[PDB]
Design a protein around this motif. Structure first.
Motif, PDB file in Angstrom:
ATOM      1  N   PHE E   8      12.441  41.399  35.163  1.00  0.00           N
ATOM      2  CA  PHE E   8      11.976  42.664  35.705  1.00  0.00           C
ATOM      3  C   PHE E   8      10.525  42.905  35.315  1.00  0.00           C
ATOM      4  CE2 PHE E   8      11.778  45.170  31.872  1.00  0.00           C
ATOM      5  CZ  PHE E   8      12.735  44.637  31.040  1.00  0.00           C
ATOM      6  N   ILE E   9       9.763  43.438  36.261  1.00  0.00           N
ATOM      7  CA  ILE E   9       8.354  43.780  36.091  1.00  0.00           C
ATOM      8  C   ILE E   9       8.115  45.026  35.234  1.00  0.00           C
ATOM      9  CG2 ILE E   9       6.197  44.165  37.334  1.00  0.00           C
ATOM     10  CD1 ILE E   9       7.432  41.391  37.620  1.00  0.00           C
ATOM     11  N   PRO E  10       9.026  46.060  35.216  1.00  0.00           N
ATOM     12  CA  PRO E  10       8.717  47.329  34.530  1.00  0.00           C
ATOM     13  C   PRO E  10       7.954  47.244  33.216  1.00  0.00           C
ATOM     14  CG  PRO E  10      10.871  47.490  35.483  1.00  0.00           C
ATOM     15  CD  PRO E  10      10.246  46.226  36.027  1.00  0.00           C
ATOM     16  N   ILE E  11       7.127  48.258  32.963  1.00  0.00           N
ATOM     17  CA  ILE E  11       5.980  48.099  32.082  1.00  0.00           C
ATOM     18  C   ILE E  11       6.319  48.366  30.620  1.00  0.00           C
ATOM     19  CG2 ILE E  11       4.348  48.534  33.912  1.00  0.00           C
ATOM     20  CD1 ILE E  11       4.377  51.383  33.421  1.00  0.00           C
ATOM     21  N   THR E  12       6.995  47.419  30.002  1.00  0.00           N
ATOM     22  CA  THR E  12       7.013  47.114  28.573  1.00  0.00           C
ATOM     23  C   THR E  12       6.814  45.628  28.342  1.00  0.00           C
ATOM     24  OG1 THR E  12       9.441  46.978  28.544  1.00  0.00           O
ATOM     25  CG2 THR E  12       8.424  49.097  27.933  1.00  0.00           C
ATOM     26  N   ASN E  13       7.368  44.795  29.220  1.00  0.00           N
ATOM     27  CA  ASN E  13       7.079  43.379  29.388  1.00  0.00           C
ATOM     28  C   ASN E  13       7.497  42.542  28.188  1.00  0.00           C
ATOM     29  OD1 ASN E  13       5.762  44.052  31.884  1.00  0.00           O
ATOM     30  ND2 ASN E  13       3.960  44.621  30.675  1.00  0.00           N
ATOM     31  N   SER E  14       8.096  43.146  27.161  1.00  0.00           N
ATOM     32  CA  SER E  14       8.607  42.389  26.028  1.00  0.00           C
ATOM     33  C   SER E  14       9.908  41.671  26.351  1.00  0.00           C
ATOM     34  CB  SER E  14       8.807  43.312  24.829  1.00  0.00           C
ATOM     35  OG  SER E  14       7.571  43.858  24.402  1.00  0.00           O
ATOM     36  N   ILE E  15      10.570  42.038  27.447  1.00  0.00           N
ATOM     37  CA  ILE E  15      11.738  41.300  27.904  1.00  0.00           C
ATOM     38  C   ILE E  15      11.348  40.213  28.901  1.00  0.00           C
ATOM     39  CG2 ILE E  15      14.139  41.596  28.597  1.00  0.00           C
ATOM     40  CD1 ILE E  15      13.572  43.335  26.314  1.00  0.00           C
ATOM     41  N   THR E  16      10.172  40.316  29.512  1.00  0.00           N
ATOM     42  CA  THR E  16       9.560  39.177  30.177  1.00  0.00           C
ATOM     43  C   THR E  16       8.752  38.321  29.213  1.00  0.00           C
ATOM     44  OG1 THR E  16       7.958  40.821  30.951  1.00  0.00           O
ATOM     45  CG2 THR E  16       9.512  39.936  32.569  1.00  0.00           C
ATOM     46  N   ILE E  17       8.530  38.798  27.987  1.00  0.00           N
ATOM     47  CA  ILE E  17       8.245  37.883  26.888  1.00  0.00           C
ATOM     48  C   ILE E  17       9.416  36.934  26.701  1.00  0.00           C
ATOM     49  CG2 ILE E  17       7.975  37.754  24.381  1.00  0.00           C
ATOM     50  CD1 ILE E  17       5.422  38.511  25.934  1.00  0.00           C
ATOM     51  N   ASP E  18      10.631  37.445  26.879  1.00  0.00           N
ATOM     52  CA  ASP E  18      11.882  36.717  26.739  1.00  0.00           C
ATOM     53  C   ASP E  18      12.160  35.771  27.909  1.00  0.00           C
ATOM     54  OD1 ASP E  18      12.430  37.975  24.290  1.00  0.00           O
ATOM     55  OD2 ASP E  18      13.373  39.684  25.294  1.00  0.00           O
ATOM     56  N   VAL E  19      11.220  35.511  28.821  1.00  0.00           N
ATOM     57  CA  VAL E  19      11.432  34.476  29.825  1.00  0.00           C
ATOM     58  C   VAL E  19      11.513  33.123  29.131  1.00  0.00           C
ATOM     59  CG1 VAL E  19      10.327  35.807  31.642  1.00  0.00           C
ATOM     60  CG2 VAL E  19       8.966  34.225  30.273  1.00  0.00           C
TER      61      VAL E  19
END
Lengths: 475, 284, 190, 154, 173, 173, 153, 173, 173, 95
Positions: E8-19
């Motif tokens: 997900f793009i939503p703006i904290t991006n620490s879970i797209t750190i988790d990619v």
């Protein structure tokens, strides 16, 4: 308002359409649509104008501005048309298509609990419901329009007409789910009508084309001159184009039976130049007249040529396409079997027919020629090098043995023309045919190539004597 | 109800002059616009129902959607054929209407000019009104209470006036039709169809290729099915006034003006008429 | 204009009224009967029977069960007893909708026509020459009263003038055929 | 609280007017607002309402952007100039049904999105017909005057 | 397809750190070539929660999320915060659809669960703050597609799509 | 505050009661008093599997399941059967609503995990086959149908109300 | 007091001159009588939307108005309908400027470029009950200068 | 006389104070006490360039730079940048006007040259991203007066006015 | 592109064109062809002041200067008499528009340093004094258009346009 | 004219009065009840029961809870405590 002129013309096997895409329907019949004349007259005006502009200025102008330039003649969103057409086709009847009875209820029973596809074929004055699941059951119908025998011949023997029947002839029928008969009897019943109406074809459709003027259009800038130029584009429309469908393949070809006029001050040269076709008597004699009419629109008798006006707009070659008349690619042969050549043209436009498998004797220079000239061709770029080795002929600049280069057709990527010339299912054919004669019984096939704007440059005489051998074996 | 709309098409083919065509077409447009939806699993359709046809029939296989948009084009063409075939003119209620009106105007001591004009080619009056607008994109001037197409008296008065103002100058027109400081001296009535040969409405098509198109690249046909008034359909209307002064320029102008356009798209020869008869009932 | 199923008799249009509209007709007849001698008990009677069914969409003069009025309003119509005689004195039926529904149905029942003005030279629509008007359909029925005072000439006005008065032209747009109307005296069509 | 139709029209307009980007798209929306309010009278609200949804050509993305416009502000109606115009005028109509509490927003989005509840929407609209008709035709008249002012002509 | 991953793009991006683990094959479907992101996949009825943000489910159909669907792994083989569904691509509610995909996938979507002593109280969130669309084009749109971004970063039209498309309904608890 | 559970009306019967349907308070949202079932909750993006008829979360928003809301205790023993949300009663999609409810609530809905072994191909099921359009119509109602013994004899309409509303989606794997 | 009758003299003087054609004058005389009673019956906000729509303010007409605030030889372009409605719109804005109901700087930068027109109309809507109370005597004065200084048609 | 200078509210950091010590006198233009911020200056025809918060003159009236012009002189350094403008204070467009200014006001504005390198296409930058919303107060507002962040419970409003009042344009190139 | 310059039209001959040769291409912007003057540019927040008028940059938006845009170069490399910005012509606030203008244009605008040492105190000035419009015609409207008024018959239809259109502001010192 | 929102019992119009209009009716009744022996307690007590609920929009013989009067004006009505026997006897309610 007053009558400007009158053009008694005839059409050869016109395929005029309608709401059902046929010339006849359950309600009325029109073999000539006065809306198609006005629409084609405008199309043959934006072509002739850009011809007069690629012979005196080296410029090409978009369609949306040429008509904006002529909107004081043909009309637009801002002005009613100054000329109004009125077609009075002969025999003036009602003559709708009526299907008296169609005794088909076994093929209904042949279609329960199954997903087949009915297909109609007209075998020896009798039609058959070709269920592709092996049931060629006949049908005993009774209707109007008296398909004689000739159209049944002419349609089955012309590979183009028979190819366009592939739509009007067949339809699948799902019946695994809930089915009926009152519903199937009405699905199949119209399938007949939409099929037999395809056979309301007639040669020698004689009609008149009255053209009126309003006498209320004050001479804004070149009204008296814009108008008499439009008459020129109307003659070349009559002399090079036809009405109806597949006019790029000879159908609906127009002739001239007798031209009258009623305002000498305008129509003077037009009727005279039109008078020169009532008694054509030799093939290359008309090849002179075809050029005689054309040049009198060019440098000779320059009809006021006011291009220096802030209405026009030069095109962008990498994103626009414009058709104009190359005065050189023109060929007038002679024929005595219209139906034969009408069915022969398929030999010259198909990538396997026995006229260009001789002239352009290969795969790629053959196809790539059609891809750039024979309108839009279904080319499936899923096979091997035969998308690039035809591209190698149509690149903007690369190793070319034949001059078929397109203005911005690049390899290794697709520009606007790269997709347009390849994937755009509505592209007219630059290579065209037209059969013309009257009062002499001397039919002359005419072949020509409209000059487009997407072409980088074309070797004239080469592709001419391609067209030359073309018009030779088409007879 | 939704159970009411699914049955609206059967109502057209079983009445043929007796439904409200205005409301019947408008209700149909709810099906034509939800065509994909009315096809999903909406059974309980009668044997007479014309929506089964598009369940049975099938035109594409690789696309659920592209199968539907083709079915919708056919459905529109089919609807135009239902209206034009079923809804046919009954002109007895119009003759009873115009004969009653004409007697009224005699009571009021007018000089009446009965006029029958006959459609020569497929006419198009009120093409921008609202009848099939929600289906065909075009319309026809339709009187939803006479349940008939019609030609507005304002249109006939406006067409006749443009011919006199063009022929007889300006001061003669504003002496017959008035201006912002004189009332007009001629009244017109709407024109209603009183007799047809076979049909009243008739399907047609307009397929622009090059309209607002820059080049040959942006060209592509956009077919537009619609309804037009059939040929050989007689429209009756009235013209009444009080000054004999204005009797001549109207009886003169009428035959000429009809042979030219009397509607939409007459530049390509659609709405051309034919003076069928003129009756002049002098007041006294 | 009406579209309906389930009827041995098809209708292209129907008459529509509301209860608030009959009340004001009752109110008119109530007061003028107390402000004069004329007492039109027959009209009052017919209207009182209709007003007793207030709150429900009823159907006079026919047997419709449910219809769609003006393409947009589906109504379920009770049937007032068939013996309540016609007040329009005609053959087409007459619905009496409850005033919440009938206020929408009646307003969309007016004819609304766009007209234009043409450029005399371009033969095209002028700039800002497009407007729309509103007509009331043919055969609409309006109720009014004409009252007089003892004057030795109100007697003549009622005796001779009001009798020889049937057709009148009302309102505007007279030269496009609008405005012709008929006066039907309750005295003789009660 | 409760917004009058002219305040509800300003709110709905400044969302659409900003979502439209190409001026050709706005000039189309100017044509929509002018004659779609006259069509709702002549052919009822319900027939004209679904006409708009069809002419909108609600693709998966176009319908997606329209939903975003209800909540976000960066939402931009994208498509052809005649598609987004009818797509904008659909939002105008939806913004009214939602705010006036006539039809729940969930039911409305679920109608435009999935085909099954679309038929159920056709029913709710025939019950609520006297509710919508009384009011909406003066909120749309404000949208018409707001567009003839804030959008140059044809 | 393969084991698929929705971020997900939503703006904290620490879970797209988790990619996590990339294509392995070549299963990049979210085309971003010239016009911007394509084949975006929207989930309806969920919310990113942007705090241990893992797409907690809800019941409203008006709240939704938008992100990227790329060939991934269950975050170093940890299958507690993922669903791992399989659909025939018929029921893939994609937006900005371009081209086509085959008819079966193994899609992993983050997961959370409702925890009581609070309400849900979901609210919409837009995307702004051009530093943020630099924070994600550098982090979450780059270390997934850092083969481009020498050519299509000022003909970018991806922030034109990030700000436009990638709205969502954060919990904001 | 009162907590409620979520049962529905499926073609199947795998949700027999699955719960203690009463919490000590006989309050009910899905009121069937006046003219039929009211306030019936619709859940979007879910299917029932027609076997262990709990709900499968699906990314398709065109998945369709709807049921009634009853107040009870959610079989506190088997806490592996739901997901126990808590929404403010304005964030759930109801149908035939009544006098509004604007306060937080806790709801339990039968949830069965993805259980990835095959691909989901959901299909629509109406309610027909009168064999059950009466039998379990009594059963699921019999918690509130023996009261309806006065509301079903003479106020019998809700047998045709089941026919229309509850047209959920069974996964039909 | 009569400050608003003096204010209506300055305003009408600007309009009476910026309306070149005499048929455009006779149209503003029509607007002055009708648009004052419509603010009475219908209210300010409905009438303002009506005015601002028939004005057809693109940007060309906005400069004519913005200049007319300052210059005394600006001229309204358009036809009798557009100019008269645009003139009456200036009549109104002139009052809200010379009475501190709107900051003139705001009103001029709002009329200018693209979208703060929506901000203006949004703001004008919040001041609606104040405006419709204060302009009654002013618009009624404009209505009487119009009927006096401009002949009928 | 009364020296004043311009400092506005962008997302950037170069605007932190951007100009050395205040006048030292008790005079300012903008109130901060009751309704949040008052007398916010709005300058038209300028953008902030996403960095180096200086105002390059554009031509269109749409470009805003909303900020708090305060008393002071620019940086006590090179005067190669700032406008050094004098005006009678009836010629600067304030918003949220409060206690009236009455004298001429010599003001300094962070002016950049037109910078004719390429086209200037302005990009409207709205203010969001709460973390900087406090940082803006932490780096600008709390120092210009110091009656804030020290004795104000009205800090809550200063968190909101930034995301409500100031909204500008930027070249971003 | 075409390097275009902005000759404002005040009453004074302080214009004295003092700029370079015409287009160098084929197209001006400020046409005078048949319906009068066209594409008249408007600048806001500037006053010409006609003491070698050079549009002293004010900040009051109520101050504007109109004028013509003709293509020329800023006075033989003396690039400090002007501003020399580069803009995409979408922001060009034009009046009496006639036709299209492209996506990138260079605009040279006679510019002055902010006239400090004085508070601006600018006041509106119109154009009148037929002696001046007769001058202005032969001064710029003929020196830059000594090809019009000759292919054009009616000239004194557009003379009053200078009196009608070209208002401005000035410090009036 | 009324828009009967927040109810399903539909009225087309309604009687609307205000408190200042009632105070002038109380004054007329209080005065002439002293300048004459005639008392109007049945009317004076209806009016005074209404005037107790001042500072609030009330509806007497209805259950509305909301309305939009004359197309523009939203009102949140609070029904009277118990009832008042229809001061102006008609089925139409009084606000």
């Amino acid at each position: 308002e007053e009558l400007l002129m009158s053009l008694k013309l005839k059409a050869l096997y016109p395929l005029t359409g309608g709401y059902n895409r046929h010339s006849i329907n359950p309600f009325y019949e029109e073999l000539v649509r006065p809306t198609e004349i006005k629409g084609l007259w405008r199309w043959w005006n934006r072509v002739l104008f850009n011809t007069l502009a690629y012979s005196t200025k080296g410029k090409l102008y978009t369609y949306e501005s040429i008509d904006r330039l002529f909107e004081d003649v043909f009309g637009s969103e801002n002005k009613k048309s100054a000329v109004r057409l009125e077609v009075i086709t002969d025999e003036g009847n009602d003559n709708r298509f009526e299907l008296s009875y169609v005794e088909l209820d076994k093929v209904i029973d042949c279609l329960r609990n199954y997903k087949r596809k009915v297909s109609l074929d007209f075998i020896d004055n009798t039609l058959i419901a070709e269920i592709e699941g092996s049931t060629k059951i006949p049908i005993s119908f009774k209707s109007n329009l008296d398909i004689d025998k000739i159209i049944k011949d002419l349609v089955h023997n012309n590979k183009l007409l028979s190819f366009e029947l592939l739509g009007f002839k067949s339809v699948e029928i799902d019946a695994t789910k809930i089915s009926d008969k009152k519903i199937l009897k009405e699905i199949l019943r119209d399938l007949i009508t939409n099929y037999l109406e395809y056979f309301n074809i007639k040669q020698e459709v004689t009609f008149t084309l009255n053209i009126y003027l309003d006498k209320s259009r004050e001479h804004k800038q070149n009204f008296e001159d814009k108008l008499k130029f439009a008459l020129y584009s109307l003659l070349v429309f009559i002399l090079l184009g036809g009405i109806g469908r597949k006019t790029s393949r000879g159908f609906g070809s127009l002739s001239i039976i007798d031209v009258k006029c009623y305002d000498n001050s305008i129509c003077k040269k037009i009727e005279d130049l039109a008078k020169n076709f009532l008694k054509i008597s030799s093939g290359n004699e008309l090849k002179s007249k075809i050029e005689s009419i054309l040049d009198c629109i060019k440098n000779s008798c320059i009809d006021t040529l006011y291009i220096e006006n802030n209405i026009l707009s030069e095109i962008d070659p990498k994103k626009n396409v414009v058709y104009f008349i190359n005065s050189d690619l023109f060929e007038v042969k002679r024929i005595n079997d219209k139906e034969k050549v009408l069915a022969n043209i398929y030999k010259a436009v198909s990538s396997e027919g026995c006229c260009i498998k001789s002239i352009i004797t290969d795969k790629y220079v053959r196809k790539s020629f059609l891809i750039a000239f024979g309108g839009y061709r279904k080319v499936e770029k899923d096979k091997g090098l035969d998308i690039g080795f035809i591209k190698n002929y149509l690149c903007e600049t690369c190793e070319t043995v034949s001059s078929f280069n397109i203005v911005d057709f690049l390899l290794s990527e697709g520009s606007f023309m790269s997709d347009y010339i390849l994937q755009y299912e509505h592209r007219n054919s630059l290579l065209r045919f037209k059969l013309i004669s009257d009062n002499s019984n001397n039919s002359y096939l005419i072949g020509y190539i409209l000059h487009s704007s997407y072409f980088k440059k074309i070797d004239i005489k080469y592709v001419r004597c391609i067209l030359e051998k073309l018009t030779y074996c088409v007879i | 109800a939704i159970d009411f709309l699914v049955n609206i098409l059967e109502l057209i083919k079983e009445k043929q002059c007796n439904i409200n065509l205005f409301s019947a077409i408008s209700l149909t447009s709810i099906v034509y616009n939800n065509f994909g939806e009315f096809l999903s699993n909406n059974q309980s359709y009668s044997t007479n129902n014309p929506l089964l046809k598009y369940h049975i029939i099938i035109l594409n296989d690789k696309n659920k959607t592209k199968d539907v948009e083709e079915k919708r084009n056919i459905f529109k063409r089919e609807v135009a054929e239902l209206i034009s075939r079923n809804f046919k003119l009954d002109g007895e209620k119009v003759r009873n209407y115009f004969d009653s009106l004409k007697e009224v105007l005699k009571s009021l001591k007018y000089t009446i000019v009965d006029v029958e004009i006959t459609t020569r080619t497929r006419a198009l009056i009120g093409v921008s009104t609202s009848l099939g607008k929600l289906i065909f994109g075009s319309g026809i001037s339709f009187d939803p209470y006479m349940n008939l197409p019609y030609i507005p008296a304002s249109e006939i008065k406006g067409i006749v006036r443009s011919y006199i103002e063009g022929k007889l100058g300006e001061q003669e027109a504003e002496e017959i039709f008035g201006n912002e400081e004189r009332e007009g001296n001629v009244n017109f009535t709407d024109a209603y169809p009183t007799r047809s040969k076979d049909f009243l409405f008739v399907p047609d098509v307009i397929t622009p290729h090059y309209n607002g198109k820059k080049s040959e690249a942006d060209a592509e046909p956009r077919p537009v099915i619609h309804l037009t008034i059939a040929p050989k359909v007689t429209f009756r209307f009235l013209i009444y006034y009080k000054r004999e002064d204005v009797g001549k320029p109207i009886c003169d102008s009428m035959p000429i003006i009809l042979i030219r356009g009397l509607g939409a798209r007459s530049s390509v020869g659609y709405s051309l008429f034919e003076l069928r008869k003129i009756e002049v009932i002098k007041a006294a | 204009r009406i579209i309906e199923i389930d009827s041995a008799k098809p209708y292209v249009w129907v008459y529509v009224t509301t209860y608030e509209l009959l009340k004001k007709v009752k109110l008119y007849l109530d007061s003028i009967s107390q402000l004069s001698n004329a007492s039109f008990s027959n009209l009052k009677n017919k209207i009182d029977t209709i007003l007793a069914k207030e709150g429900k969409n009823i159907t006079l003069d026919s047997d419709l069960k449910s219809a769609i009025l003006n393409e947009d309003f589906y109504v379920e119509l009770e049937a007032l007893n068939n013996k309540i005689p016609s007040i329009i004195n005609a053959g087409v039926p007459l619905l009496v909708l409850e005033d919440s529904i009938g206020r929408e149905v009646i307003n969309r029942s007016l004819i609304r026509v766009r007209r234009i003005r043409i450029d005399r030279d371009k033969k095209v629509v002028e700039t800002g020459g497009l407007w729309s008007e509103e007509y009331v359909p043919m055969k609409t029925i309006f109720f009014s009263v004409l009252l007089g005072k003892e004057s030795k000439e109100s007697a003549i006005f009622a005796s001779c003038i009001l009798r020889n008065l049937r057709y009148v032209i009302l309102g505007g747009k007279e030269t496009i055929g609008k405005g012709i109307v008929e006066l039907r005296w309750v005295k003789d069509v009660i | 609280l409760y917004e009058e139709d002219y305040k509800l029209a300003l709110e709905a307009f400044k969302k659409v007017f900003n979502a439209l980007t190409h001026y050709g798209a706005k000039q189309a929306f100017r044509s929509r607002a002018r004659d779609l309010v006259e069509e709702i009278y002549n052919s009822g609200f319900i027939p004209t309402f679904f006409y708009i949804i069809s002419k909108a050509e609600l693709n998966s993305d176009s319908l997606d952007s329209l939903i975003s416009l209800f909540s976000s502000d960066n939402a931009i109606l994208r498509g052809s100039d005649e598609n987004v115009s009818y797509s904008a005028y659909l939002f105008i109509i939806l913004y009214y049904l939602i705010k006036r509490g006539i039809i729940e927003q969930k039911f409305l989005i679920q109608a435009l999105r999935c085909e099954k509840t679309r038929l159920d929407l056709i029913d709710k609209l025939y019950n609520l017909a006297p509710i919508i008709s009384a009011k909406i035709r003066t909120y749309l008249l404000a949208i018409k005057r707001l567009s003839e002012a804030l959008i140059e002509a044809r | 397809s393969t084991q698929r991953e929705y971020v997900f793009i939503p703006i904290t991006n620490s879970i797209t750190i988790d990619v996590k683990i990339t294509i392995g094959g070549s299963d990049h479907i979210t085309n971003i070539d010239e016009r911007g992101i394509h084949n975006v996949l929207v989930i309806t009825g969920y919310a990113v929660d942007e705090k241990n943000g893992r797409l907690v489910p809800t019941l409203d159909p008006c709240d939704y999320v938008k992100g990227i669907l790329v060939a991934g792994t269950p975050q170093q083989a940890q299958s507690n915060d993922f669903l791992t569904l399989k659909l025939p691509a018929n029921k893939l509610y994609l937006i900005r659809k371009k081209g086509n995909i085959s008819d079966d996938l193994k899609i992993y979507i983050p997961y959370s669960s409702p925890d009581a002593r609070n309400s849900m109280k979901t609210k919409p969130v837009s995307i702004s703050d051009d530093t943020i669309v630099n924070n994600i084009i550098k982090e979450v749109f780059d270390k997934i597609y850092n083969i481009t971004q020498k050519e299509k970063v000022k003909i970018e039209k991806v922030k034109e799509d990030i700000k436009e498309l990638f709205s969502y309904y954060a919990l904001e608890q």
